[PDB]
Each structure stands twice: as C-alpha cells, then as structure tokens.
Symmetry: D4
Subunit: 200 residues, 8 copies
C-alpha cells in the first residue's frame, strides 16, 4: 500500500505574522478602538522594553468587553495570498512537513488553518457575546518547537519571532528585519519563495 | 477571567475508536467492498499475529482506487454522542486539556475535529478523486504522546490502543476490554464519564 | 472511587517572604539584638555584594547563643493574612498544587506550615536551650524546584528570590520589585490575587 | 556546630507500613465496616491479581460516606514505638536524612508526621464530615523517589512496597517478607535497627 | 536549484548483504579455502548459537595469511544490479539521504562505495600482501545508526541484520526472511523497489 | 583472530583548510572568474560581518553556471604534501582514528579522500555540464563532531574553523591564527607535526 | 615524547579475580577459620541463589574479630605473575589505560596496587587490630564503570563479574567460564594475553 | 555484617595546592634550574594571559632532560601538616568521602597519596633517568569531578583551581583568594578546618 511517511519529514515552521501576512491584530484593535495605548504596548513588547507576557496581557486587558462580532470580523481582513500559498506548496514539493504558528488568535488567522500540515495559535475566550481573555496554548514559539525535537527544523519568521524560536531550528530565515539566531535574512516573502524554489 | 493558561494543564488524551465511537473504518470497508481479507488483516493486526504497519499497509492496498465519495460516506456513521460530548466537557471542567487521537482518517473522523482542544489522526491521499494511500502522520500513539512529555498525561483508550501508548501515560484507563499498561478498566463510555465526574 | 489527582497538577510555588508576609526574620533579629551588622550583612547578601551563603552563615554566626525562647517567640509576629490565604485558596480553585518555600526557619514561619499542599524551609539547631546554627535543607530555591521537574511550574516571589528560581519556572511573577527571570511584575499581593482570580 | 548541610546527605527512605507499624488501614476498615470485599480487594492488589490503582480506588469507593470521626479513630492504633524511634534516630547518627513515606493517609499516620526529616503520604477528602475520596499525592513510591534523584538512597520497606520503589534505591532492605528488587531481607524491625547500628 | 539541504533529510540505511547483493564473503572464503569450519562458524553466528564477535574473529583467524589477490578476486562476484541502482536512485527521489552499510569488507564491497550518499563497512589488514586481520570500524549496526540519531531513519536489511539495528530505525523493512524488530517484510529486492516507488 | 578495534579509538579531527593545505577554493574562484565580490563575501564571512550560511550561499550564487570542467580542474591545484601525510600517519601511530573534514567540495579536495580513516565535505550539484549549487552535508563542523560523541576528540583546525567546532573537542589545537575554544596555538603544520610526534 | 594524553585513551578494565590471580579470599577464610558456611555463602552468592550483598555481608559477619595479621597473611597468596604483568604491559602498548578492579579487599590485593594505571577495590575496617567490617567503595562493578562513561571500554573478567559489568563494556572478554554479557570467552590468562598481543 | 557505605557518601574534593600545602612545584623548578621563564609561564597561566594547557606544556618543555633524581627529590619538601590531616580527618567525621586532586605530579605529592579516600594527580614520564614529559590523567578539575556526578560534592580549592571545578560542586569554598564559582572564601586552612569542625 502507498504511503506518505509524513512523520519522518524535516519540518518547516512558519511564524505567520510578517511572513505570510502583514495583518497585525493588535494594530487593527488600536485602530478600531481608538486606544493608542494598545499599539504603544505592542511596541514596548516588540522592542523588549517590557516583558512579552506583560505587554500581551495588558493589551488583552484593554480590549476586554469588546463585542465578539467586532473581534471576529477582523478575520475579514485576513487572506491567504497566492504568494503565501506558493511558499507552502513549494515547501511540500521540497519534502517538508509544514507547520504554521502564531501567538495571535486562531479565530482571526482562521483562513490559514488548513494551509499547512499543522496549525497552532492562541485562542479567544468569549462570554455572553463579549471578549473576556486569551487562552495561551504554548509558552512561546521556542517551546512550541520542542514538539518537533526528534527531527530537523527549518524555521521562517519575522517581527513577532525572536531568538528563542530560532535557536531551536537547524536553519533559520528571517524576513524583512534581522532576528537574532537566524542564519539568513531575505528581504520579503517573494525572496523567501525564491530561496525555497531553489531547494534540492 | 481574562486568561486560560492552557499550555500548563495536564493532558487528557483520548484514543477515539472504542471510547467515543464504535465506528470501525476498516470493518466498514470490508462490508462495502465485500473484501473479507480487509477485516481478516485487521484481526491479525489487533491480535499481533502480524506486525501492525504490515497489516495496515496491506489494508490500505486493498482499497486503492475507491472513490472519495464512498470513502467520505462513512463519516455519516460517525457522530458525537451526548455522552462523548459530556466526557470532553467534564474533562475540561476537571482541569484537563483534551487531545483526541486516532490512527484512522481525519477525513472520516471529522465530526470530532473541533470537540477537543487538539485533534490528530492520519490522512488520506486522493488523486483524481480516487484513494491512493495513507499519510502516516505519527509513528504510533506512544510516539505521538512524546508531544506532551513536559507535563502529565491521563490516557483513555480501547481496542486500537496498546501498551506503547499507555506506557507514556501517568494514568491510563481502558474501556471495554483490558489493555496492557492501562491502570484501570471501565465497562463502557458511561462508566468513564462517571469516573471523570468523580474527579477533584 | 473519587480522586483528586494532585500529583498530576501544575505546581504553584510561592516564596513566602515578600509575597505572603513582610515579616523579615533577620531584620527582627537585628532589632532584638541591637546588632546592626546583622542587617548590613542582609543588605550585602540581597544586593549580591557578597555571596549569599557567605552572608547567611555570617548572620547565623552573629545570633549563635541566643535563647531558644527569644528565637521561637518571633513566630508571634507571623500571621497568615486573609489576603495570603485568599491567594492560596484561589490557586487551588484554579487547579494548582500549592507549594510554599522559604530560606528562613520553619520554626518561625510555622503558621504557614499547613496553608499550601507542601511546605519547605530551613530549620534551626538548638542545644541546651540556645540557638547553635542552621540546617540547610535545600541548596537554593532553583534547586528545590527540581522536585517538580516532571510538570509545569508557576512561581511567585519577591526580594528573597532570584533569577535561579525563576528560570526553572514556566511562568514567573515578581511582587513589588523586579526580579530577573520573572515574566510579570505585580505591585503587591492584592494584585497577585487579582491576577490569579482572573485565571481559566 | 552552626551548620547541618542536610541537603547534601544520603537519603534513608522508610515505607512506614510493615516496617515501623503493623497497622493496616484497609484491614481495619474491613473490620469496622464488616465489608469483607475491602480486604479481598487489598489481597488482590498486594498479590497483583488486579492492578494496584484499580484495587485502591475500589476500596476508596467502599468507604465513601464514612464519618471523619470513625476514620480518625484509627490513629489510636498507630503509635511510634521505642524501636521505630530508635531506627530513625540511629539513621540520623549514621548520617542519613530520613524520609518517611506511605500510600496510606497522612491523617491516620499523623503520629509519624514529625518523626523523620520529611514526611509524605496520600490525603483524604472530607465533605461535611464524611469521607468522599482520596487525594493521590504521588503516582507510586518509585515515582516519589525521583524527588531524591540527585543523591544516593537507602530504601527500607515491607509488604506495601514493590520492585518499582527498590529499583530507585542504591541499596534496599525488605522487612519480614522478600520484596523483588531489595538487596537484603531482615527478619523484623529489631533486626533492621541492629543492621543500621552496625553502619560506619 | 542551487542548494540540496542533505544534512536535514531522513536517512535511508541499507544493510548491503541480502538486500543489494547475494554475495556472501564468508561462504566464498569457505569455498575457496575448502575450510568448512568457516561456513559453520557463520551459521553458528547467524543463528546466535555463539556470540557474534566470537564467531567473526574465529572466521578472521581461519583466513590469516590468505593473499590479497585471492581476497580481492571476490569483488568480481559483487555487482551493482539495475534493481539495486533503482532502489538507491528512487530513495533519493523520495527525499532520503542514502547510507549503505555492511559488517563485511569495504575492499570487497567496493562496487557499492559511491552508490549511496554515505558508505560504511569494516576494513582488512594486509601485511606484505597477506591478510592479517580485521579493522572493526563500528561496534555493531545498531551502534552505527547512532550517527543519525538527530533525525528519522528508515532501515532496510536482511540476514546479516538483527533487532539491534532495527530498534534504532523509525521504520524497518526486512527482505526475504523475517528479522526481529522490522516492521515490514518484503519478498525480494524487486518488491522493495516497488514499495519505495509507492512513497509520497 | 587479529583486530584493530578502530571504533574504540580517540578521534583526531582535522579541518583540512589551513592545516593540511593552503589552497582556498573561493579565492581561486575569485581569481578564475575575476569576480572580486567572491573574495569580499569570503572575508565578510570569516570575520563574522555576515552570517556564515548567508555569505556561503551568496558565493555559490556568484559561480552558478560555470563550466563543470573549470570547476573540477581546481583539483589539479590540490596536493597531499609529505608534511600533511606525516601528520596523519603519525596520528595513527599515536593511536588516533583520523577524520578529515571541510566545508568545501569533496570533488576538489578529492586528493585527501582516502588519507584519513574517514572523510567528509560538502558536494557540488552539476546539471548539463554547469555548476548549479551546493549539497550541504552537515550543518557546521560543531554538529558534525556529534558523530563522535561517544568517545574523546582531538580537533585541529585553522581559519575555516570556529568556536563551535572546538568546544565539542576534548583538546583543540589551532594552526597559524588563534581560534576561540582552542587550547593550543601552533605556528604552522610543521609545528603541529612536532607536537603529535611528541605524543605517548 | 613529552606528553601522554592518558585521559583520552580507551579503558581496559580488568576484574582481578579469575583473570590475574586464582586467589579467592573467602575460600581462604573458610579454610583458615574452618567455617564451611563462609564458602557455602560464596557459592550461593555466585550462583544467584541469594542476593549478592546479602551473601557478602553474611560472610563479612562470619569473620568479625579475626586478627589483622591473619587477614594480611593472605596477601602472601597473591602474586603478580609474569603473565599478569605481560597482559597489563601489552594493553598499554596497544593504547589502553588499564584499570584493575575487585570487590575484594585492597589490603589483600596490594600486590596489584601499582600494576595498572588505576586501582579500585573495597577496604577493611579494623578496630584494635581486629576485623570489624567492610567499606563498600562502589555499589557493584557495573556502577563503578560509569566512572569511564565518557569513553570506550574493554572489560575482562571471570567468575566474580556479571552481566551488569559487561553491559557497560563496549567489548567484553570472559576468562575460563562464560559470563552473561561478555562478547568473547578465552580459555585462560595465556589465551587472553595472546588475544591482546594480536591487537592493532 | 558491619558496613561503611562509603559509595553513598557526599564527596569532599580538595585541590591540594594552596589548601593543604604551599609547596609549588613549578616555582621550585624555577628556583632549582634558575630558569625564570618557568615562573613567568606559570603566572601567565594563572592569570589567564595564556591558555592553561599551553603554559603547562611550555613549562614541561623547559625541564625536559632534568635528572630523575633532582625531580623526585622535590618530594622531600612536601609534608602533610597536622592541620592538613586535621581537615581530612574531620571531613570523615562529618560523613564525607574525601578525594584529593592536583594537576601536579603524583610522584612529588606522594606524601598525600593515602591521606584521603581517593587520590588523583598527573604523572611524570622518565626515560634513561631523565624527565621527558607529563602524563595528563584528567582533562581539568571540572571534568574530573564528573566521576562523582551521582552524588553531592563539596569542593575546596585555591589558586590552582578555577570556575570549572567550582560549578560542578554543590558547595564550594575558596582558600585565601577568591575563585569564581566558589560560595565561600575562607582566609586560610585553619579557618577552613574551623568551618568543617562546625558541621552537623
């Protein structure tokens, strides 16, 4: 009988934000609510001026109570581009099992849910039709990569990734801005696609 | 309550077949195709008269070419019962993250896809609408459990599980027939629900 | 039969001093004896100006000979506050096994002895009714956390904790003054209670 | 002598039942309730005719509802004998840290709570003064010993221990009946005391 | 396509004898020398009637002094068949790095030296053109596989392999006679080629 | 029977470039093509001004399309010197198994292929008689040394090695320019030979 | 030759009794004291009819009080033979570091104390010139071998060794009687010397 | 039978030079030979101005050829002081197994050979009555401590020790000059004796 021995394949992990999409949930939330503190907390988090979990929970705090519909509607701004799909299809062609990860909400990044072979993000807590908080489903992206510790890992990411994710990977590629731990920096998604297309 | 620290929770792994459903894809394939050899191969696999992967791939071979529609028709025999739903909801109340697994096809077990916190099974290969083979997405259920090695695990399963899976669990419960390595044996899903309801 | 599977629960470790109580044994000893060197050695230890074990043993040296009664009477100044109890009860509610730790004396922190699910501190050596020295019952708080290496750990602490304790934890919260390794800083016990109350 | 480096000492673990006391809670429960099934379940557990946890939880089930007073009355049958006290004091003289363990209830084994340097057993759940179930505070005695994995262990035990516990020990002594994995068998507690007195 | 990330690929290990060739050096040595004891020692080794290394070194002893020319003449009986070449080329197409191993001599198995991506076997010691002994370049085939412990392994082998080698493999295939630890048994090299051709 | 227990021997790893030869493929390529960017990228890589993999792939990019013959002809400039051979023969004399490694092409460093006991370098991809790219056969020299993790390692290297390789070694010797992690610096190959000759 | 890198060498461990000497301390004690029970206990230990430590301590008990002079007189029966010396010297020539071990007394095996590169055995306790007991300086011979876990080990031994010791060895040789776990069996010390002389 | 379970005891490792003795072999060699370079190389080594192995081998180089008698006579300047003996006897009293280590020559430090329970130093190579070189018997003192990794370690040392040794220890005490990694600094041997005398 025919088999695709997927479990034995080198793994390609893609951190979605800043690689596959430029949609940024917290910037959208800042825009929607008019609360600039949201975006400022985001910048403090990205820069390392405050601890990541701290800025994250403060942002969650700032949108507590917002309508579930307003929240879920942000999904309408998320799309899988032909280029994003091209990256993923090509990785499969080149023999990778593809895993998409994000620290944002599965509810919002839903369009990516079946794109790769596995998908993982955080989730949202709704009560009586209002957003209440976040389900933290992995500690950080570094820890999440431990799921694939028995094999090799190519990791691709951008501004929402950090050195913790990259030092778990056997090869790491940053997209658009250098990330400590990454072996390569490519200038944009198109260039990442070109690199992968060159594989074999 | 703006935060569910899901990543830190003890894991409740449920092997779907023989716990949540009595649907058995290969017995159904034997019925539909009339190929008794399929069910015989299953019996040989389950009893350990032949190696499991050997038996599985031989079964896969015997349904090569079967139409995707015939294949997908079987999901009509797969339903989330009130009891199965109560098990999973109660597990969450009792502070578990719930992971549903199977060595059968995700496409057929689709009704369970969103019931737990995580879902994992094998997948099917279709070419021009006809079944070509299996995508093996984990080596075996014990190997899969290594995904949750950093915390504690309660495993529940039935006839499609074995000692390898239960060896990984901190506490294991078999349903309906003793399984080597399980700590406990409950009579049926009802008894299992009652047991979980007694927790804490 | 009903069970609380306590052994499988994520662990909440609380460093008592500066989280649950502001009683500080060595400052009390300085006050009682009039020996300011005691408190100066404490400051040198906390600041890292001298190695921790060194300043500790020097402090022990300075109270050698003090009456066992005078020593044990300091317990009268220690109380479990409603807020401290609230923190611990709420952690249990949210599914944690609670472990209280301190590098101070079990004899003095006795009121906390049965508050959590486990309790660990150092002990005192008395001979002929006088204090002679210290029983060091764990190397440091980092090493002590190894007891719980098979599961997840939330750690909470203040001025008597350090980076060694926090890097062993999966999530760390400092109270009242930043501690390297901690993910979050809350301003006081009340705020820590509020954070935990928000869990699930 | 202002310092006892207890954390560095070899560990003497004593399984309480059948070494320090001949009190057997479940045999007493069978006597008090008249439910012979309780003792039969114990015998089945001890002989391995049924899985240990299966047997334990069935026993727990059979005393659901029993009054806390009836439960606590049994501690009257638990006493620290001169010999048991001599064992523990001599172990300390011989340079061991002493850890007393049991799979029975801390509430009943209270007389031993402060005898050793550390004490660990399971706990009981009472609701409105009536027994509801067991808090399992460690998976089994072997798993518990992992707490002391960084040093050496001498284990002493009797009928309620097994190979799992002794496999963890650097040297194991059984009392009164051979236990798989123990290096030595002594006739009774007196012989054990004599053996320890011969050390160094 | 300016890059083949070979180091990241799943490894296909082939034990040469009984998979790619039916040449058996020791049976040939028995034929050439007329020393039946050589083949008897082989049979005793293969059946486990005597320890493998004991048997191997006894065989080595029995050909001490044999001319290098006689030794090298045997490579004339070793040829890369179209089928053997197809196996290796197809494995590469299917995304494997191919490692050929044998416990026999590299000097005799020279035709296979460049067929795979890596090649490993034992070597011969010649002094003044006469055979003196064996260079053992790995302990056994299982130990050798530790070289590829950081990724996944598909192992293929026949009569000169054993459980030790297959225990190391994530998936193992035996050819022509069942081998303990192999998942699958294929009839002959043709069947093996067909199996690999079915991958992905 | 006589044996050379090679598998049990301490391992001597030699990074070829700058120890055994001063031939530098990328400088030769710069010379041949007239493309100074090649050599500049090399300097940026060696100095750590760009990530190693990044400068490597950029260099590969710059010679894509070059005639396979021009490429392979560079081998004519590579020779095993008497001194290089002396180093290797002496290491064997002193009881080492010798492993030669390089990040350059096996096709070009071919003259060294059978010098040591094992040989490993990267390889070249040719299509229609033109160079297309590189096969990366190990992640870096540090990772490659993991192959020999079960024994002791003496490592010798120069300008194409780095701290990653040396911290895997039990003793490290740099040749001609200091390398972080190296225990010793010798001034040239002759001096390295002298050091090894002094062993035992 | 100003340097012997001894720490890097493969280790040759020799269990003294039954390889280098046929002196058996306990059989001699049985002869001198006339206590047949001593030799019977030895036989029971060697055959595994009783646990080894149990048997050893019972033998130790039976010679309590024996004069140090009587004890030391036995070293007259322990001599380094020309063959034993040749084994050790040849092992060094062949590039091994030589470690001599025994579970018997260093005081009696004193003639071997400086023969190897390292020497380890148990020791005796004398009080006022009379034998009081044994100092157990390692748990068992397998545990002792963990000392050399960072390199390779060739183990040689006879009747006082077991599978535990040989399991630790990369290659094991028994002398005079098969021992579980040994790869090879040689007839006597002469054969062993001849085997080692054949190395490299 | 009586036993001293030495193998189970916490280990006290003493780096001899600068704790037990102020004899400094290389300073004596400088004095004897008049070669000031010897002492300068020593200072460069101690200060970290040159790599330790490098300065060591250069010093060895500078005394190559010196009379074996002149070399061995330096032993006459080495004595076990009452204070040194007091330290060691007291450590045994307080339940430690005592291990003495040095990077100097066993031949010269011979008077310490039987002081502790184990002794380890480097050794000298003599040929035709002249010093030829050094046998390096352990990599460094940190690596040597791995021998005792299964238990706890108290380490004491001075100027010839470094952070590598101390970070392997559970408690570290420096004597006379601070050493990175040490918990405590005592001013001289007398004070170290006083500290140990205070133990229990």
């Amino acid at each position: 009988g025919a088999m695709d021995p997927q479990f034995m394949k080198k793994v390609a992990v893609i951190d979605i934000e800043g690689t596959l999409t430029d949609f940024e949930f917290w910037r959208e939330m800042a825009r929607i609510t008019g609360k600039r503190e949201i975006e400022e907390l985001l910048e403090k988090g990205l820069s390392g001026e405050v601890e990541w979990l701290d800025s994250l929970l403060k942002r969650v705090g700032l949108i507590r109570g917002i309508d579930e519909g307003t929240f879920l509607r942000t999904r309408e701004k998320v799309n899988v581009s032909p280029e994003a799909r091209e990256l993923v299809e090509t990785l499969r062609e080149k023999g990778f099992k593809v895993v998409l990860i994000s620290g944002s909400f599965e509810e919002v990044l839903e369009p990516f849910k079946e794109l790769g072979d596995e998908f993982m993000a955080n989730r949202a807590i709704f009560e009586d039709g209002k957003f209440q908080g976040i389900r933290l489903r992995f500690r950080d992206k570094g820890e999440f990569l431990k799921r694939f510790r028995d094999g090799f890992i190519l990791a691709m990411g951008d501004g929402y990734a950090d050195a913790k994710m990259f030092e778990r990977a056997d090869m790491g590629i940053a997209v658009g801005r250098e990330i400590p731990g990454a072996d390569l920096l490519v200038k944009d998604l198109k260039e990442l696609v070109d690199f992968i297309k060159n594989l074999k």
